């Protein structure tokens, strides 16, 4: 009875569509129509960070807003002091095709990973002093696209085998495995409370997961192409996605709907990175046209354009205190704006 | 008074840069290759975990070959990593289902990608003995063979059928039909004919890489 299951699934998705179209009593634009506009926002490159030989695929801020890690496909992790533009560490990797890097909230660990299907975990605060590898977590089938810590003992990884995983670093084992994406899972973002996370794959679908119940809660559609970036809203009741269809979209977790699209007629390049401000009123987005637009989140108006990279920007991150935004790009340069 | 704390930072950074310079000079002295192919294509014959790494040295020049082992057949997200390589080695079984047209479609997609516009291809058309012994024993799958005539640059070895030459030159022209329609001097195509066992392929990759680097330099000076 394959056809019966097909028609059951279609009846179910039509019931979901009916349940969603009854809760859209008004649009976000109709409610934020009277808010005063944010004003044109102009940032400047405070610091430019040089030292990487090749393209930068990943950066992650530290939780103290000074230290910053970056990954280059020449095979080096570098931890920078952004206030002084000093390289605090420089870690040689074993496989050069790094594609993700993360920073532990405690500050004693850094995780890399890429086309080797392994997530390595480096110890920065070691008894001797030089940065060695603590664990190499094998067990994925495809490349490692993202990874985020939870504590110094847990880490969630996203992969090209259509699977997210939860790891226990002391054992090297896979606690929970997350299944459901039919395409390569390209991004993650943890909630502020570390009880959920949302992932976006190359099937135009974002899914919400329960880290302790190990199950998928809601599924969000609306994009027309692959989802490259996901960032949570500052309170954990929304998130924003970037796609290859040159649009960002804003979804709600309690309405189970999409609220806003951030698109322009002169934008035909895909989106790489996404970030919210500390207030959540601006949405920063990096594009393949080497720029970074700054949107009004409560509206759909562009408040500024960060210009200055001469290749594909692939990385964004706003600090925990909200002082700076840091961009990396395929021109092997990091920039800090303010 | 914490210049005590800042001079230590400057010293650590100085040591990091003096090592990064050595890493730079060993990075830019090495060439990187992406071995790409299909199943049953002879990609493993040329070699003789998501990434397999092969290191070798021809004429005191260090090459670094990579082969994607444990990845799925999606390719549109991890092939963007292998821009900024010298060449993409592309292996094709030139001999059930049409694998020749599929290799053609893959070559077309690699050629016209927005990020691989600057990367060139060393085309290896494998399995020439099989092609020969099948043509003496192609028109069903490609209707323009009976229309096709052997090129003026036909240079077979002494002892060759005039009809196997035509098959292999037809396949080469079918790849050059794609590589010629776009690019106009940012990336190139280096087609070659290889059998099962022959050791000239390493020297061929060496020569093609020399040509690629020379063209890069002549383009920096705006002479090409």
């Amino acid at each position: 009875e394959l056809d019966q299951l097909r028609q059951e699934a279609e009846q179910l998705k039509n019931q979901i569509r009916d349940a969603r179209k009854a809760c859209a009593d008004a649009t976000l634009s109709q409610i934020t129509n009277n808010i005063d506009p944010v004003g044109r926002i102009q940032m400047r490159t405070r610091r430019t960070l040089r030292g990487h030989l090749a393209k930068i695929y990943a950066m992650h801020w530290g939780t103290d807003s000074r230290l910053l890690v970056s990954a280059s496909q020449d095979g080096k992790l570098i931890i920078w002091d952004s206030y002084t533009t000093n390289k605090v560490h420089a870690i040689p990797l074993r496989s050069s095709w790094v594609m993700t890097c993360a920073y532990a909230p405690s500050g004693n660990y850094v995780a890399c990973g890429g086309l080797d299907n392994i997530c390595s975990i480096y110890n920065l605060k070691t008894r001797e002093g030089n940065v060695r590898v603590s664990r190499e977590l094998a067990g994925h089938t495809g490349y490692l696209s993202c990874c985020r810590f939870l504590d110094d003992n847990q880490i969630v990884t996203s992969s090209g085998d259509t699977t997210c995983a939860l790891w226990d670093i002391e054992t090297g084992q896979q606690t929970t495995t997350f299944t459901g994406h039919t395409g390569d899972v390209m991004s993650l973002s943890l909630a502020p409370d570390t009880r959920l996370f949302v992932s976006g794959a190359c099937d135009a679908s974002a899914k919400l997961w329960d880290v302790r119940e190990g199950m998928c809660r809601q599924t969000f559609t609306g994009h027309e192409s692959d989802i490259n970036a996901i960032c949570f809203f500052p309170n954990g009741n929304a998130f924003a996605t970037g796609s290859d269809d040159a649009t960002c979209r804003l979804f709600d977790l309690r309405a189970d709907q999409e609220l806003m699209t951030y698109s322009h007629d002169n934008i035909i390049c895909g989106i790489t990175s996404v970030s919210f401000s500390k207030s959540g009123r601006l949405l920063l987005a990096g594009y393949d046209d080497f720029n970074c637009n700054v949107w009004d989140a409560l509206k759909a108006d562009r408040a500024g354009v960060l210009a200055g990279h001469d290749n594909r920007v692939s990385c964004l991150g706003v600090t925990d205190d909200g002082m700076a935004v840091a961009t990396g790009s395929w021109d092997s340069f990091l920039k800090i704006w303010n | 008074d914490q210049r005590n704390e800042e001079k230590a930072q400057r010293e650590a950074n100085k040591k990091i840069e003096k090592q990064l310079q050595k890493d730079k000079q060993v990075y830019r002295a090495t060439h990187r290759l992406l071995l790409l192919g299909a199943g049953e294509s002879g990609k493993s014959t040329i070699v003789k975990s998501g990434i397999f790494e092969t290191k070798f040295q021809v004429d005191k020049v260090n090459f670094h070959m990579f082969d994607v082992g444990a990845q799925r057949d999606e390719r549109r997200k991890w092939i963007q990593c292998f821009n900024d390589v010298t060449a993409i080695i592309f292996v094709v079984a030139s001999s059930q289902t049409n694998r020749l047209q599929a290799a053609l479609k893959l070559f077309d997609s690699i050629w016209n990608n927005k990020w691989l516009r600057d990367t060139s291809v060393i085309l290896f058309l494998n399995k020439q003995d099989l092609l020969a012994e099948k043509v003496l024993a192609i028109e069903d799958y490609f209707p323009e063979f009976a229309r096709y005539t052997t090129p003026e640059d036909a240079t077979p070895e002494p002892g060759e059928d005039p009809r196997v030459t035509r098959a292999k030159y037809f396949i080469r022209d079918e790849f050059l039909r794609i590589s010629t329609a776009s690019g106009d001097g940012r990336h190139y195509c280096y087609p070659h004919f290889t059998c099962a066992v022959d050791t000239e392929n390493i020297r061929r990759v060496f020569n093609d890489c020399r040509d690629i680097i020379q063209r890069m330099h002549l383009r920096q000076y705006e002479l090409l």
Epitope: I268 | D73, K105, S109
Partner: nanobody, 126 residues
Framework: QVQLQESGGGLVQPGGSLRLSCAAS????????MNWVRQAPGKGLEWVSD????????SYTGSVKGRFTISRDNAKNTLYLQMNSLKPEDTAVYYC?????????????????????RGQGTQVTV
């Protein structure tokens, strides 16, 4: 949601004809390049025909040139295939595949076993 549903398959006397159709929903049909793939019983997914954003460039595989015809109707969001002079070697389930990203001259992984922007198929048995 991206949705592609094909229609028109059936049993055809060898030498007959069919007109397959593909309705698309969830995206701007005019920004993409569209495809037809094919899965014969016991064999892999092969490629039949593409068409550009405006139907200017059209490519066919070798064993369908002169017989098949592709066409778009961007206002009606429908893609077509006209199969003429059918052979027993054409018995396969036919899909309507869409290239992943818009405005791109290339598109990659259409004949993959797990491809997202592909319909569920329709059966033609000559």
């Amino acid at each position: 949601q991206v949705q592609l549903q094909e229609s028109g398959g059936g049993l055809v006397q060898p030498g007959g004809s069919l007109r397959l159709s593909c309705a698309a929903s969830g995206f701007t049909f005019s920004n993409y390049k569209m495809n037809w793939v094919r899965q014969a019983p016991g064999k892999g997914l092969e490629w039949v025909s593409d068409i550009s954003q405006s139907g200017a460039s059209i490519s066919y595989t070798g064993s369908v040139k002169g017989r098949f015809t592709i066409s778009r109707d961007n206002a009606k969001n429908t893609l077509y295939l006209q199969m003429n002079s059918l052979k027993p070697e054409d018995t396969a389930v036919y899909y309507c595949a869409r290239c992943p990203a818009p405005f791109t001259r290339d598109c990659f992984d259409v004949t993959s076993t797990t491809y997202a922007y592909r319909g569920q198929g329709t059966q033609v048995t000559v």
